[PDB]
Design a protein around this motif. Structure first.
Motif, PDB file in Angstrom:
ATOM      1  N   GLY A 157       4.457  87.201  26.214  1.00 55.72           N
ATOM      2  CA  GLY A 157       4.281  88.191  25.170  1.00 55.72           C
ATOM      3  C   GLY A 157       5.414  88.171  24.167  1.00 55.72           C
ATOM      4  N   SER A 158       6.567  87.646  24.583  1.00 57.32           N
ATOM      5  CA  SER A 158       7.728  87.546  23.713  1.00 57.32           C
ATOM      6  C   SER A 158       7.823  86.125  23.179  1.00 57.32           C
ATOM      7  CB  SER A 158       9.000  87.916  24.473  1.00 57.32           C
ATOM      8  OG  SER A 158       9.132  87.142  25.653  1.00 57.32           O
ATOM      9  N   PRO A 159       7.636  85.894  21.875  1.00 55.61           N
ATOM     10  CA  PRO A 159       7.750  84.522  21.352  1.00 55.61           C
ATOM     11  C   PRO A 159       9.168  83.979  21.364  1.00 55.61           C
ATOM     12  CG  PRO A 159       7.438  86.068  19.552  1.00 55.61           C
ATOM     13  CD  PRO A 159       7.294  86.862  20.817  1.00 55.61           C
ATOM     14  N   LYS A 160      10.165  84.793  21.722  1.00 56.70           N
ATOM     15  CA  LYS A 160      11.541  84.309  21.749  1.00 56.70           C
ATOM     16  C   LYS A 160      11.704  83.135  22.706  1.00 56.70           C
ATOM     17  CE  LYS A 160      14.624  87.507  22.417  1.00 56.70           C
ATOM     18  NZ  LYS A 160      15.700  86.606  21.918  1.00 56.70           N
ATOM     19  N   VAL A 161      10.922  83.102  23.781  1.00 57.95           N
ATOM     20  CA  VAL A 161      10.969  82.020  24.759  1.00 57.95           C
ATOM     21  C   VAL A 161       9.892  81.008  24.393  1.00 57.95           C
ATOM     22  CG1 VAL A 161       9.366  83.089  26.390  1.00 57.95           C
ATOM     23  CG2 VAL A 161      11.099  81.451  27.208  1.00 57.95           C
ATOM     24  N   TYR A 162      10.296  79.751  24.229  1.00 63.54           N
ATOM     25  CA  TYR A 162       9.359  78.705  23.847  1.00 63.54           C
ATOM     26  C   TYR A 162       8.354  78.455  24.964  1.00 63.54           C
ATOM     27  CZ  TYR A 162      13.265  77.992  20.654  1.00 63.54           C
ATOM     28  OH  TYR A 162      14.275  78.176  19.738  1.00 63.54           O
ATOM     29  N   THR A 163       7.097  78.237  24.578  1.00 59.31           N
ATOM     30  CA  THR A 163       6.024  78.048  25.547  1.00 59.31           C
ATOM     31  C   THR A 163       6.083  76.695  26.244  1.00 59.31           C
ATOM     32  OG1 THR A 163       4.674  77.527  23.605  1.00 59.31           O
ATOM     33  CG2 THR A 163       4.361  79.685  24.633  1.00 59.31           C
ATOM     34  N   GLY A 164       6.953  75.786  25.801  1.00 60.18           N
ATOM     35  CA  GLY A 164       7.081  74.511  26.486  1.00 60.18           C
ATOM     36  C   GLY A 164       7.533  74.666  27.927  1.00 60.18           C
ATOM     37  N   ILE A 165       8.497  75.559  28.169  1.00 58.90           N
ATOM     38  CA  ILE A 165       8.941  75.815  29.541  1.00 58.90           C
ATOM     39  C   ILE A 165       7.802  76.351  30.401  1.00 58.90           C
ATOM     40  CG2 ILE A 165      10.374  77.383  30.893  1.00 58.90           C
ATOM     41  CD1 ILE A 165      12.516  76.826  28.548  1.00 58.90           C
ATOM     42  N   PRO A 166       7.016  77.338  29.960  1.00 65.31           N
ATOM     43  CA  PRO A 166       5.817  77.703  30.734  1.00 65.31           C
ATOM     44  C   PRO A 166       4.872  76.538  30.971  1.00 65.31           C
ATOM     45  CG  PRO A 166       6.311  79.435  29.163  1.00 65.31           C
ATOM     46  CD  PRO A 166       7.369  78.373  28.973  1.00 65.31           C
ATOM     47  N   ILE A 167       4.723  75.636  29.999  1.00 68.73           N
ATOM     48  CA  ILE A 167       3.844  74.483  30.185  1.00 68.73           C
ATOM     49  C   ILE A 167       4.363  73.603  31.316  1.00 68.73           C
ATOM     50  CG2 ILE A 167       3.296  72.255  29.139  1.00 68.73           C
ATOM     51  CD1 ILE A 167       2.861  74.004  26.486  1.00 68.73           C
ATOM     52  N   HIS A 168       5.669  73.323  31.310  1.00 72.68           N
ATOM     53  CA  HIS A 168       6.253  72.518  32.377  1.00 72.68           C
ATOM     54  C   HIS A 168       6.117  73.216  33.724  1.00 72.68           C
ATOM     55  CE1 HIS A 168       8.567  69.196  33.878  1.00 72.68           C
ATOM     56  NE2 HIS A 168       9.511  69.984  34.360  1.00 72.68           N
ATOM     57  N   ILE A 169       6.323  74.534  33.747  1.00 69.35           N
ATOM     58  CA  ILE A 169       6.178  75.284  34.991  1.00 69.35           C
ATOM     59  C   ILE A 169       4.752  75.170  35.510  1.00 69.35           C
ATOM     60  CG2 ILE A 169       6.240  77.587  36.001  1.00 69.35           C
ATOM     61  CD1 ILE A 169       8.462  78.063  33.670  1.00 69.35           C
ATOM     62  N   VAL A 170       3.769  75.293  34.618  1.00 65.69           N
ATOM     63  CA  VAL A 170       2.374  75.151  35.023  1.00 65.69           C
ATOM     64  C   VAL A 170       2.131  73.756  35.582  1.00 65.69           C
ATOM     65  CG1 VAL A 170       0.000  75.107  34.179  1.00 65.69           C
ATOM     66  CG2 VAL A 170       1.552  76.920  33.418  1.00 65.69           C
ATOM     67  N   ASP A 171       2.722  72.740  34.949  1.00 69.59           N
ATOM     68  CA  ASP A 171       2.470  71.362  35.361  1.00 69.59           C
ATOM     69  C   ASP A 171       3.131  71.026  36.694  1.00 69.59           C
ATOM     70  OD1 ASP A 171       1.046  70.946  32.974  1.00 69.59           O
ATOM     71  OD2 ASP A 171       2.880  70.394  31.904  1.00 69.59           O
ATOM     72  N   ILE A 172       4.231  71.695  37.041  1.00 69.55           N
ATOM     73  CA  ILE A 172       5.004  71.322  38.225  1.00 69.55           C
ATOM     74  C   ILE A 172       4.891  72.322  39.369  1.00 69.55           C
ATOM     75  CG2 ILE A 172       6.625  70.134  36.705  1.00 69.55           C
ATOM     76  CD1 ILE A 172       8.658  72.285  37.240  1.00 69.55           C
ATOM     77  N   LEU A 173       4.286  73.494  39.156  1.00 62.92           N
ATOM     78  CA  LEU A 173       4.268  74.507  40.206  1.00 62.92           C
ATOM     79  C   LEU A 173       3.537  74.008  41.446  1.00 62.92           C
ATOM     80  CD1 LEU A 173       5.101  77.448  40.867  1.00 62.92           C
ATOM     81  CD2 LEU A 173       2.843  78.150  40.050  1.00 62.92           C
ATOM     82  N   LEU A 174       2.309  73.518  41.274  1.00 60.38           N
ATOM     83  CA  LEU A 174       1.545  73.043  42.423  1.00 60.38           C
ATOM     84  C   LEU A 174       2.127  71.755  42.987  1.00 60.38           C
ATOM     85  CD1 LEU A 174      -2.119  73.787  41.296  1.00 60.38           C
ATOM     86  CD2 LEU A 174      -0.385  75.308  42.267  1.00 60.38           C
ATOM     87  N   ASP A 175       2.691  70.903  42.129  1.00 59.64           N
ATOM     88  CA  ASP A 175       3.286  69.660  42.609  1.00 59.64           C
ATOM     89  C   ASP A 175       4.488  69.932  43.506  1.00 59.64           C
ATOM     90  OD1 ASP A 175       2.094  67.272  40.502  1.00 59.64           O
ATOM     91  OD2 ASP A 175       2.004  69.363  39.845  1.00 59.64           O
ATOM     92  N   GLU A 176       5.295  70.937  43.164  1.00 63.37           N
ATOM     93  CA  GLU A 176       6.484  71.250  43.946  1.00 63.37           C
ATOM     94  C   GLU A 176       6.189  72.147  45.141  1.00 63.37           C
ATOM     95  OE1 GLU A 176       9.549  69.875  43.354  1.00 63.37           O
ATOM     96  OE2 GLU A 176       8.422  68.692  41.888  1.00 63.37           O
ATOM     97  N   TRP A 177       5.198  73.037  45.033  1.00 66.73           N
ATOM     98  CA  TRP A 177       4.888  73.925  46.149  1.00 66.73           C
ATOM     99  C   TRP A 177       4.420  73.137  47.365  1.00 66.73           C
ATOM    100  CZ3 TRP A 177       4.843  79.265  44.272  1.00 66.73           C
ATOM    101  CH2 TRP A 177       4.877  80.195  45.318  1.00 66.73           C
ATOM    102  N   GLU A 178       3.582  72.120  47.151  1.00 64.56           N
ATOM    103  CA  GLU A 178       3.129  71.290  48.262  1.00 64.56           C
ATOM    104  C   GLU A 178       4.277  70.527  48.907  1.00 64.56           C
ATOM    105  OE1 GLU A 178       0.917  67.639  47.071  1.00 64.56           O
ATOM    106  OE2 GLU A 178       1.073  68.453  45.038  1.00 64.56           O
ATOM    107  N   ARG A 179       5.385  70.336  48.187  1.00 66.44           N
ATOM    108  CA  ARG A 179       6.550  69.678  48.767  1.00 66.44           C
ATOM    109  C   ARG A 179       7.190  70.508  49.872  1.00 66.44           C
ATOM    110  NH1 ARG A 179       8.710  65.569  45.904  1.00 66.44           N
ATOM    111  NH2 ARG A 179       8.185  66.545  43.896  1.00 66.44           N
ATOM    112  N   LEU A 180       6.911  71.812  49.919  1.00 63.37           N
ATOM    113  CA  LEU A 180       7.477  72.672  50.951  1.00 63.37           C
ATOM    114  C   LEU A 180       6.763  72.535  52.289  1.00 63.37           C
ATOM    115  CD1 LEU A 180       9.901  74.582  50.436  1.00 63.37           C
ATOM    116  CD2 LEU A 180       8.718  73.818  48.364  1.00 63.37           C
ATOM    117  N   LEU A 181       5.580  71.930  52.311  1.00 64.29           N
ATOM    118  CA  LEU A 181       4.821  71.772  53.547  1.00 64.29           C
ATOM    119  C   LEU A 181       4.497  73.130  54.162  1.00 64.29           C
ATOM    120  CD1 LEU A 181       7.050  68.936  55.065  1.00 64.29           C
ATOM    121  CD2 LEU A 181       5.193  68.720  53.401  1.00 64.29           C
TER     122      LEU A 181
END
Length: 217
Positions: A157-181
């Motif tokens: 909701g705050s444009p002060k934070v660039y949406t690129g970081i949310p994009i990377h988080i979306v791209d890596i969340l499931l990839d990294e969560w499965e690393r926890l087993l």
RNA sequence: GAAAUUGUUGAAAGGAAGGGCAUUUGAUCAGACAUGGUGUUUUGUGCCCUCUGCUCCUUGUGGGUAGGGGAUCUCGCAU
């Protein structure tokens, strides 16, 4: 200050800074203080990472930088139904400082150094959700981490934070969560609120709808 | 030491000459110290094999440089 050595131009000084920080950070009683010091320390670590632009060494630095989170209050206490008193609150400050530094100094990253910071944030996210308590599963710790993370990176909701970081988080969340087993607090899926929050960045909404909600998991 | 201009040698052409399109003839000018590339077979070497060292940063998927032992050798070179 400690940040001076971390941002020094000499490799020996930079490595000695991290070697001393490995204990300066496990000196928790000293570091249980204002978040501004943590923000400054993470800003210094940002420059320290910026000073290395070689593929293998940058991975070496990134792995240790990510492991620094685990080094902070190593879960040897085994907090049996104990709250964040003096143990998890301090780590929350370090996590907040990391995200503040990353968001503030996002556009300053050059084209070639972008991959370094993507790897660094991936490693830090892997260390997170691995170290809240001894493992991911924790009600109060997850609630505090969500409230202290949802408000900074994925707010949308705050444009002060660039949406690129949310994009990377979306791209890596499931990839990294499965690393926890198989079962985890993954309440964390925030994304529904982002979709429901109208007027938000349409690009982020489309990306989360496509890459995140389309997965079978 | 160039033109306007003047005299000689040579070529050409002849009540004019000058320019354009295409070409013959006459005269004359350029026209590769290019001499290679590929796979195979002997022999001698090194940055090649092995042993023993020194030296620069930082630290790195490195660089530079030595002393003993051979033709497992085409890793390159010369035959």
């Amino acid at each position: 200050n400690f940040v001076k050595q971390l941002s020094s131009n000499n490799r020996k000084t930079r490595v000695n800074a991290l070697e001393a920080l490995k204990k300066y950070l496990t000196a928790k009683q000293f570091k249980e203080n204002k978040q501004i010091e943590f923000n400054k320390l993470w800003k210094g670590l940002y420059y320290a990472m910026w000073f290395s632009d070689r593929p293998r060494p940058q991975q070496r630095l990134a792995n240790e930088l990510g492991e620094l989170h685990g080094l902070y209050f190593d879960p040897k206490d085994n907090s049996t139904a104990d709250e964040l008193t003096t143990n998890d609150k301090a780590f929350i400050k370090f996590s907040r400082g990391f995200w503040k530094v990353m968001c503030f100094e996002w556009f300053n990253i050059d084209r070639y150094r972008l991959d370094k910071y993507l790897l660094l944030i991936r490693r830090v996210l892997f260390s997170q959700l691995k170290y809240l308590q001894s493992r991911n599963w924790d009600k109060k710790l997850v609630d505090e981490y969500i409230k202290k993370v949802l408000r900074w990176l994925p707010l949308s909701g705050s444009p002060k934070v660039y949406t690129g970081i949310p994009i990377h988080i979306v791209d890596i969340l499931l990839d990294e969560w499965e690393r926890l087993l198989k079962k985890t607090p993954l309440d964390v899926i925030i994304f529904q609120d982002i979709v429901a929050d109208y007027n938000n960045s349409k690009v982020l909404r489309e990306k989360i709808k496509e890459d995140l909600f389309s997965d079978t998991r």
